[PDB]
Amino acid sequence: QTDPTLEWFLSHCHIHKYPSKSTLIHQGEKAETLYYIVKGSVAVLIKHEEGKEMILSYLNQGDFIGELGLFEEGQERSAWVRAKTACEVAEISYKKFRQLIQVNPDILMRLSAQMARRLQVTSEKVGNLAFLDVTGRIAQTLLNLAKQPDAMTHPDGMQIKITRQEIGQIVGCSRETVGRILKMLEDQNLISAHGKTIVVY
Amino acid sequence: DPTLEWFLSHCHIHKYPSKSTLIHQGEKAETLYYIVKGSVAVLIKHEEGKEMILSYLNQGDFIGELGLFEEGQERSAWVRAKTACEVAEISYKKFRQLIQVNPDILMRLSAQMARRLQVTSEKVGNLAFLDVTGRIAQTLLNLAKQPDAMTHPDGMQIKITRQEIGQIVGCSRETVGRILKMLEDQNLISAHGKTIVVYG
Numbered sequence: 001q002t003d004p005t006l007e008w009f010l011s012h013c014h015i016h017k018y019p020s021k022s023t024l025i026h027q028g029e030k031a032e033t034l035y036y037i038v039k040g041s042v043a044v045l046i047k048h049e050e051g052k053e054m055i056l057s058y059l060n061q062g063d064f065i066g067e068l069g070l071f072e073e074g075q076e077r078s079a080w081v082r083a084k085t086a087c088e089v090a091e092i093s094y095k096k097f098r099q100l101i102q103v104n105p106d107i108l109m110r111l112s113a114q115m116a117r118r119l120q121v122t123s124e125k126v127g128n129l130a131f132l133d134v135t136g137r138i139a140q141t142l143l144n145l146a147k148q149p150d151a152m153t154h155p156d157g158m159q160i161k162i163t164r165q166e167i168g169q170i171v172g173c174s175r176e177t178v179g180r181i182l183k184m185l186e187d188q189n190l191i192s193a194h195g196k197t198i199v200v201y
Numbered sequence: 202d203p204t205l206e207w208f209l210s211h212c213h214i215h216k217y218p219s220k221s222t223l224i225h226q227g228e229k230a231e232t233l234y235y236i237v238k239g240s241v242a243v244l245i246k247h248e249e250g251k252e253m254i255l256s257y258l259n260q261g262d263f264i265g266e267l268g269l270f271e272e273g274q275e276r277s278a279w280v281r282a283k284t285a286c287e288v289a290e291i292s293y294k295k296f297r298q299l300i301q302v303n304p305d306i307l308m309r310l311s312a313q314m315a316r317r318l319q320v321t322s323e324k325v326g327n328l329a330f331l332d333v334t335g336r337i338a339q340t341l342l343n344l345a346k347q348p349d350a351m352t353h354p355d356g357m358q359i360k361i362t363r364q365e366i367g368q369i370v371g372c373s374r375e376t377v378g379r380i381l382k383m384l385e386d387q388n389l390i391s392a393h394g395k396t397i398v399v400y401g
């Protein structure tokens with residue numbers, strides 16, 4: 001589902017394909033381009049020497065990406081953005097976009113609605129990490145990604161596909177610890193695990 | 202600035218004393234704020250004697266902007282006046298009417314949202330990669346790297362309460378007390394009255 005405005009915006013971009021796991025944005029690169037996911041999904045990650053990679057968020061079709069450096073020249077990509085599946089994404093220079101903004105501010109309103117949402121979601125994440133114990137953090141995380149578009153409904157909850165590695169990267173724990181906690185969450189009858197498939201209740 | 206004075210002329214301004222609450226988490230959001238003077242703390246709570254300051258906002262900063270793009274939303278957090286403040290306020294409706302006239306007012310707001318997203322995202326990385334002790338240790342270091350930080354013959358000197366430290370890391374004031382002591386025995390810092398010396 002799309003609309004005129006959106007299509008108007010798109011007719012000003014170049015759509016490029018990206019195989020699963022390929023990197024769309026490298027942290028540190030000069031920020032001079034805006035992106036738009038027409039198809040597929042991506043992960044946004046940050047790195048910290050020792051411990052390594054952490055997943056800030058998943059973004060999907062309809063999501064803008066690479067927008068954080070738009071309002072001030074000379075900024076660096078604040079994160080790594082990698083394809084989680086085959087992706088088709090539009091791109092336009094900040095300059096051309098700042099122009100379309102003047103033509104029709106609605107395009108900025110749509111981008112802004114998403115930034116506001118991201119700030120609400122990232123803030124909630126900040127709190128969960130500071131206030132929840134590792135158990136609650138993982139328990140909540142399973143609820144969140146159960147809210148993702150790729151989540152398949154279960155005749156008694158919601159079914160998701162995730163790795164102990166990904167969970168650990170979202171909550172900030174090792175896959176070993178995640179496994180041990182998933183065991184408890186299963187025992188406590190809160191989830192059902194079968195391979196890399198989890199059924200959240 | 203012509204754009205900002207214009208923006209403000211359409212708002213109603215009010216004075217808020219210290220410790221005063223401008224925004225209550227959970228309430229329906231139908232209005233936007235703009236700090237003309239003063240400072241505020243944006244914070245979230247776990248009502249277990251543990252608060253977390255997501256950020257400080259100052260003169261020239263917008264507040265309550267998160268519920269502007271979708272109706273039926275609630276305030277994502279509590280905003281408390283740090284010092285006396287003069288805050289302009291305007292409903293989302295009138296603000297959306299100003300955006301049509303000149304989108305620049307929206308650009309300025311959005312630039313602040315992007316900065317805020319970048320800063321909060323950095324915070325996320327640290328909290329995930331740090332125990333309560335490490336969070337506090339790193340906070341003492343970061344506080345020593347700031348301009349207002351003072352010089353001490355042994356390194357840097359800072360002034361901050363156990364509560365304030367607790368609000369930064371999201372833990373109890375007592376937890377801060379115990380951690381600061383352990384850090385002393387580790388010969389990493391010194392604590393007397395309300396002054397903390399960070400060696401190095």
Ligand SMILES: Nc1ncnc2c1ncn2[C@@H]1O[C@@H]2COP(=O)(O)O[C@H]2[C@H]1O
Pocket residue numbers: 025031044056057059064065066067068069076077078079080081118122318322
């Ligand atoms: N907390 C976050 N939530 C969602 N997307 C984010 C977050 N932090 C960064 N991003 C995205 O990661 C992108 C990579 O570089 P930019 O800073 O140009 O733009 C970034 C945002 O689109």
Ligand SMILES: Nc1ncnc2c1ncn2[C@@H]1O[C@@H]2COP(=O)(O)O[C@H]2[C@H]1O
Pocket residue numbers: 051052053054164165168169171172173174175176329330331
């Ligand atoms: N605080 C942390 N301790 C351990 N692993 C972490 C932490 N924060 C994030 N992680 C990531 O979580 C991942 C879980 O399993 P990996 O072997 O893939 O490598 C791990 C790290 O990259």
Ligand SMILES: Nc1ncnc2c1ncn2[C@@H]1O[C@@H]2COP(=O)(O)O[C@H]2[C@H]1O
Pocket residue numbers: 119123224230243255256263264265266267268275276277278279280317321
């Ligand atoms: N991470 C953050 N950084 C800065 N300000 C924030 C953050 N999270 C919330 N706020 C502010 O807290 C305000 C309170 O309610 P709103 O959600 O309407 O708008 C909010 C934002 O202006």
